[PDB]
Amino acid sequence: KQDMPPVGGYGPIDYKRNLPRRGLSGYSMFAVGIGALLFGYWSMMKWNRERRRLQIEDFEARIALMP
Amino acid sequence: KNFSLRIDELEEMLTNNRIWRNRTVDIGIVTAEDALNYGFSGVMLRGSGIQWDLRKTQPYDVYDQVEFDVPIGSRGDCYDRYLCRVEEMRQSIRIISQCLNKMPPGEI
Numbered sequence A: 001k002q003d004m005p006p007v008g009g010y011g012p013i014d015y016k017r018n019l020p021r022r023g024l025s026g027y028s029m030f031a032v033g034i035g036a037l038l039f040g041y042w043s044m045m046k047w048n049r050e051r052r053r054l055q056i057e058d059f060e061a062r063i064a065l066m067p
Numbered sequence B: 001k002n003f004s005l006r007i008d009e010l011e012e013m014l015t016n017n018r019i020w021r022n023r024t025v026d027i028g029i030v031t032a033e034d035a036l037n038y039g040f041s042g043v044m045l046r047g048s049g050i051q052w053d054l055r056k057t058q059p060y061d062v063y064d065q066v067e068f069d070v071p072i073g074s075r076g077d078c079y080d081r082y083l084c085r086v087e088e089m090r091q092s093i094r095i096i097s098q099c100l101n102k103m104p105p106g107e108i
Helices: A033-045 A048-064 B004-015 B019-023 B079-102
Strands: none
Touching: B004 B079
């Protein structure tokens, strides 16, 4: 008399197949790429030109002496 | 009840990936009537084309009294016999969740 089949309690689990967790698509990408890229170029011309100012300063001490 | 999450893992691991797709597309394109004159059985059959199986044209036991479908892929390569096996495991979960509701007590 002690056999298995239970009265209730069932799901089931799915046979489904989906995980569309997107994801900033469709022209939202290529937008964070370009602006941060020119931001790095914007970081230039305030350092290389600044080091160029120090570069003439470095060559200044050479020319002032040597007579 | 906790298995379809594990098959959703390998879907992220292989299906949407490109390199493994690039590792197997258009490889083993055998689709003609010599794909059946060679006497092949299932997958490397019906997933390449010809719909036929021994699972609902020929009974075994109480096996027709459950509901399911059989996968078919598009072309006749390995990647369209690979995608039988993802859907095939998505059928055995249904059948087990259908078989448990229908068992009577009895003898052995």
